[PDB]
């Protein structure tokens, strides 16, 4: 029979770097109905966002 004892100390020094590039499109919509005592309106909107 045999017994083994072991100790281990590890020093790990690590580097990392990164880039990233995002390209974002977007198409918005809107409708609106306004109403007052004697004033009524309506509105339609649309939006085109690049990024």
């Amino acid at each position: 029979q045999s017994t083994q004892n072991t100790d281990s100390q590890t020093r790990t020094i690590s580097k990392n770097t990164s880039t990233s590039r995002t390209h974002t499109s977007e198409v918005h919509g809107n409708a609106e109905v306004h109403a007052s005592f004697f004033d009524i309106g309506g509105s339609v909107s649309a939006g085109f966002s690049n990024s």
């Binding site: 306004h34 007052s36 004033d39 966002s49």
Partner: peptide, 23 residues
């Protein structure tokens, strides 16, 4: 100034819109 008052009431009849950021 009646015409100016009518223009002011017409301007009041609406919204100054909203401030939205999509950053």
């Amino acid at each position: 100034t009646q015409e100016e008052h009518l223009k002011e009431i017409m301007k009041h009849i609406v919204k100054i819109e909203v401030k939205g950021e999509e950053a």
